[PDB]
Motif scaffolding. Structure first.
Motif, PDB file in Angstrom:
ATOM      1  N   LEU A 192       0.821  -1.199   0.000  1.00 59.91           N
ATOM      2  CA  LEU A 192       0.000   0.000   0.000  1.00 59.91           C
ATOM      3  C   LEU A 192       0.859   1.254   0.000  1.00 59.91           C
ATOM      4  CD1 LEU A 192      -2.688  -1.005   2.671  1.00 59.91           C
ATOM      5  CD2 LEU A 192      -2.953  -1.016   0.245  1.00 59.91           C
ATOM      6  N   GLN A 193       2.022   1.207   0.671  1.00 57.34           N
ATOM      7  CA  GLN A 193       2.908   2.364   0.686  1.00 57.34           C
ATOM      8  C   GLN A 193       3.471   2.643  -0.699  1.00 57.34           C
ATOM      9  OE1 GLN A 193       5.399   3.074   4.184  1.00 57.34           O
ATOM     10  NE2 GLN A 193       7.085   3.110   2.726  1.00 57.34           N
ATOM     11  N   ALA A 194       3.879   1.592  -1.415  1.00 54.44           N
ATOM     12  CA  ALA A 194       4.365   1.762  -2.780  1.00 54.44           C
ATOM     13  C   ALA A 194       3.266   2.270  -3.693  1.00 54.44           C
ATOM     14  CB  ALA A 194       4.918   0.434  -3.298  1.00 54.44           C
ATOM     15  N   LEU A 195       2.046   1.761  -3.506  1.00 56.03           N
ATOM     16  CA  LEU A 195       0.896   2.220  -4.277  1.00 56.03           C
ATOM     17  C   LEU A 195       0.643   3.713  -4.074  1.00 56.03           C
ATOM     18  CD1 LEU A 195      -1.770   1.623  -5.841  1.00 56.03           C
ATOM     19  CD2 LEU A 195      -2.784   1.206  -3.563  1.00 56.03           C
ATOM     20  N   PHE A 196       0.608   4.162  -2.827  1.00 52.62           N
ATOM     21  CA  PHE A 196       0.157   5.534  -2.543  1.00 52.62           C
ATOM     22  C   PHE A 196       1.292   6.549  -2.448  1.00 52.62           C
ATOM     23  CE2 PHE A 196      -3.577   3.268  -0.652  1.00 52.62           C
ATOM     24  CZ  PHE A 196      -4.545   3.820  -1.485  1.00 52.62           C
ATOM     25  N   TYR A 197       2.542   6.136  -2.656  1.00 55.17           N
ATOM     26  CA  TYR A 197       3.687   7.047  -2.697  1.00 55.17           C
ATOM     27  C   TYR A 197       4.419   6.767  -3.998  1.00 55.17           C
ATOM     28  CZ  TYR A 197       3.043   8.315   2.205  1.00 55.17           C
ATOM     29  OH  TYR A 197       2.516   8.723   3.382  1.00 55.17           O
ATOM     30  N   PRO A 198       3.936   7.323  -5.106  1.00 58.61           N
ATOM     31  CA  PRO A 198       4.407   6.874  -6.422  1.00 58.61           C
ATOM     32  C   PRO A 198       5.873   7.119  -6.688  1.00 58.61           C
ATOM     33  CG  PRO A 198       2.984   8.832  -6.590  1.00 58.61           C
ATOM     34  CD  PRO A 198       2.855   8.324  -5.204  1.00 58.61           C
TER      35      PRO A 198
END
Lengths: 421, 421
Positions: B229-235
Motif C-alpha cells: 500500500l505504501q508503494a501504491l500511494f507514494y508513487p
C-alpha cells in the motif's frame, strides 16, 4: 616478556594467515614465522618468500574502514613441521580444525623450550580438549590453549602472498582451558582484534566458546544434502549454489529440518559434556548476518529454543530465504577434482565438515548420546562417497578419500574430558 | 438454433476479449459484437474498427502450440451500453467482476428479445447470484447464467486491436444457476476451450465454481500489505514487486498469515452459503502453477486443510518462495496515477480486489459470519486511502476513490441466496 613482542609461528598460510600476520605486525614488533604444507601453493609461496619475504593485504568494502593497503615481513618460512623449532613462544593454528591432530603430532615439542601459548584460530567443538591432551602428553601442560569460535574476517586471495579482506566479524567467542577471563594472551588477542572493532567474548571453558562455530551447524545440512552431494560427485552436471533454494541449491524443508535437527543433536552432546546449547537463530542473526524483522521477527529469535520443531524450521527457512535477497547467492558448490597425479580429491567443503562431524559422532556414541541427524547426514555422505570411489576406482583416489583419524581424535577428546569430570 | 452460430456480444474489449473473439470465430460462424467504455483506449479502438473491423492475435511460447497468428472480424462495435440491443443471444462479460453490477444495470434488457445466455468470464464469488437477481427482475429468468472461475489465458496487448497470448490455463471451473452438467451453452464453452486443451469442470452451482477464483485468495494479502500500500500511494518511492519477498515485495510471514487467514474466512462464508471450501494449496499447485515436490511436498498439498495454521503458513511461504526461482518475479506493483483531467486513480490491482472483497465482507456481516482477516485487510486499505486523499485533496480524486456500490451488490446477493434456501 611483553606479549605483543612474542615470536609467533603461524601454521597454515591461507588468506587468513596474511590478515593475521598484518594484525600482529601492526600491534607489535614480533618475530613472525610461517608454515605451509608443500602443496603446489605452498611451494610457490616458498620460492616467492625466499626472494622477498613480504606479504600484502588490501582492505576492501566494509573492511576498508580499518584495513587499508599493508605489507608484512616474514622472518622465517618453513614447509616441514619438523622444522617448527627454536624460540617460538606462540603457535597459531590457521589450518582448519580437522587437521589439528595431524599437525600437532608432527611438532617437535621438545625443541620449543619457550612455548607459552597455542591459539586455535578456527576451532571446532572438542578441538581444545584434544589439544590439551596432546600438550599434556608432551609435558607442555603449562602452555595456554585458546580456542576462537571462528576466523574473524572474510579474507581471500587475489597471488599466494597477496590477499584482500572484504569484511570483519561482529564478535568472536574465545576461551582458554582454565576459564580465565583476561590472561595476558587473551588481552593480547582482544587488542589485536579491537583494531577492527571486533568484539571478544570470554567463555568459561574451551567447549563453551567452540559451541559458537557457525560452520558446524550450517555446512553439514547444506553440503550433505542429496542434491549437493550429487553435484559434488558428478562434476559435469550443472553447478549448484550452496545457499540457494531448490533446484539451484539445496535449501528446502527437508534440508532445513536437518539444520534444526543437527542443532538438536549438538545440544544433546554439549549438555552431556556439561555445556549449555546456543540459541542457533539468535547466533546466526545477531552474531553473524542479520535479516529484517519483517522476515524473521525478534520473537522468533529470542524464543527460538522454546519454539516447536516445525516453527523452528519455518523460522530457519525464512531466514535463509531472506539472506538471498555478504553474498551468499554467489557461493558455488565445489566438485571433486583431480590433482597433478590425476588422483581424485574432495574439496574442503564438505571434507572438513565431514571430519569434524564424524569426530563428534564417535564421541557421542562413546558417551551414550544419540545424534540421529548427524548420523543420517554421515550415512548419506558415506554412501555417495563409496559410489563415487567405485565409479573412478579406489586406486585413482587420493588417500584422503579412504580413511581418517577421527576415531583417535574422539578417543583423545573423551579421555581429556573424563579427566576433569 | 445451433449454439456455435449464436450472435454474441462481448462486453469489455480487454486483451482477453480478442483471444475470446478469435476462439468463437474459429469454432463457428457467428455474428460478433464488441463493447468498451469510452475511455481513451476504447475511443482509439472505436476509430480503428470503424475503418477496418478486424482484431489480431498472436500465440507465443507455450500458447504457440494451439494459437498461431489469427484475425477476426467484428460486425458491430459500441461504446454506449444503451446500444446493447437487437438480436444478440449471448452476452459475454469480459469486464472485471466488480463492474458486473454497473454494466448490467445499463443494459436495456427489453431490447434483447432473443437473449439466451450471459457468461461471466472472470467471475467472483456471488457474481452469479447477483446476475440472477438482476435478470430475474428484468423478466429474463429464462436466461442461462454461466460463471467461469477465471479467464482461461494469459493475454496482453502489444495496439488496442492487437494482442498476444503467452499461455492457456490447465482447467476452468464453470456452472450455470441450475447445476446442470452439460447444457448446450456449457457444451459450447467446453468446445471453445478444448481447442487449447483446457479442461472444463462442471460444478453444482454458481458459487461452487466461483470459489475457484484464484485472485480472490491471492491478491488481497499481497496487494493490501502495508509495504505494498505504501508503494501504491507514494508513487515516487522505489518500485515493489507483488510476489517478491521483503524488502523488494510483500511476501513475509505476516502476509502469508493473511493469505492463510483470508482462506479461513472464505471457508466460513462459503460454508454459511452451503458451499464447501476449496483446498487452497492443491488448487494453487495443481490447478494453476506447480512447484517441485522437494519444496512443497504432496503431503502438504493433499493434507493442507487439516494442517495446523502455522504449518499451512510454512507451506504457503515455501510455495511462494519456490515460485520465484510464468514470470511472477516480473509483476510490478502499480501506483496511483493521474488521468488527462489530472484526477488521481487507483490501478486495477487493488481497486478490483478491494471491491470484490468488500462485497463479500458486507455479505458476511449480513449473514452473521465474521471474517477478521478480510476486515483487517480492508481497514488497512481504507486508512491508507484516506491518508492519500488528504495528501492530494478530495477534489483532485477521481470518484472511484470516494465511493462504491458494494453495499447494494451484497444486498442483492443475499436476497437471491435467501430466495433458494
Amino acid at each position: 616478556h611483553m606479549h605483543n613482542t612474542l615470536p609467533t609461528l603461524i601454521l597454515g598460510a591461507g588468506p587468513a594467515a596474511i590478515q593475521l600476520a598484518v594484525d600482529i605486525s601492526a600491534t607489535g614488533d614480533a618475530r613472525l614465522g610461517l608454515y605451509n604444507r608443500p602443496s603446489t601453493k605452498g611451494e610457490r609461496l616458498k620460492q616467492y618468500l625466499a626472494l622477498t619475504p613480504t606479504l600484502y593485504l588490501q582492505g576492501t568494502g566494509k573492511a576498508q574502514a580499518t584495513q587499508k593497503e599493508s605489507s608484512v615481513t616474514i622472518d622465517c618460512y618453513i614447509d616441514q613441521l619438523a622444522q617448527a623449532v627454536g624460540d617460538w613462544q606462540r603457535l597459531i593454528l590457521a589450518v582448519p580444525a580437522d587437521h589439528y591432530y595431524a599437525v600437532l603430532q608432527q611438532i617437535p615439542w621438545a625443541a620449543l623450550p619457550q612455548l607459552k601459548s597455542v591459539i586455535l584460530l578456527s576451532s571446532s567443538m572438542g578441538s581444545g580438549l584434544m589439544v590439551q591432551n596432546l600438550l599434556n602428553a608432551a609435558g607442555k601442560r603449562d602452555v595456554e590453549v585458546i580456542s576462537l569460535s571462528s576466523y574473524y574476517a572474510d579474507t581471500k586471495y587475489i597471488q599466494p602472498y597477496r590477499a584482500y579482506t572484504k569484511a570483519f566479524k561482529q564478535r568472536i567467542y574465545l576461551a582458554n582451558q582454565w576459564g580465565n577471563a583476561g590472561s595476558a594472551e587473551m588481552s593480547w588477542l582482544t587488542a589485536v582484534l579491537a583494531r577492527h572493532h571486533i568484539d571478544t567474548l570470554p567463555c568459561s571453558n574451551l567447549l563453551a566458546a567452540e559451541r559458537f562455530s557457525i560452520t558446524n551447524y550450517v555446512h553439514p545440512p547444506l553440503a550433505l544434502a542429496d542434491t549437493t552431494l550429487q553435484a559434488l560427485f558428478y562434476p559435469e552436471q550443472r553447478s549448484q549454489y550452496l545457499y540457494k533454494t531448490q533446484p539451484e541449491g539445496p535449501v528446502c524443508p527437508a534440508v532445513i529440518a536437518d539444520l534444526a535437527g543437527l542443532a538438536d543433536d549438538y545440544k544433546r552432546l554439549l549438555n552431556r559434556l556439561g555445556v549449555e546449547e546456543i540459541n542457533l537463530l539468535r547466533f546466526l542473526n545477531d552474531d553473524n548476518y542479520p535479516v529484517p524483522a519483517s522476515m524473521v521477527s525478534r520473537r522468533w529469535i529470542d524464543e527460538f529454543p522454546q519454539l516447536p520443531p516445525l516453527e523452528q524450521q519455518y523460522a530457519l527457512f525464512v531466514r535463509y530465504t531472506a539472506l538471498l535477497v555478504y553474498d551468499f547467492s554467489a557461493v558455488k558448490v565445489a566438485t571433486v577434482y583431480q590433482d597433478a597425479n590425476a588422483l581424485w580429491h574432495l574439496p574442503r567443503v564438505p571434507l572438513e565438515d565431514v571430519h569434524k562431524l564424524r569426530t563428534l559422532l564417535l564421541l557421542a556414541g562413546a558417551l551414550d548420546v544419540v545424534m540421529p541427524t548427524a548420523q543420517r547426514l554421515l550415512q548419506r555422505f558415506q554412501q555417495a562417497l563409496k559410489a563415487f570411489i567405485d565409479r573412478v576406482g579406489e586406486e585413482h583416489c587420493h588417500p584422503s578419500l579412504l580413511g581418517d583419524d577421527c576415531d583417535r581424535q574422539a578417543a583423545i577428546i573423551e579421555q581429556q574430558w573424563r579427566s576433569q569430570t
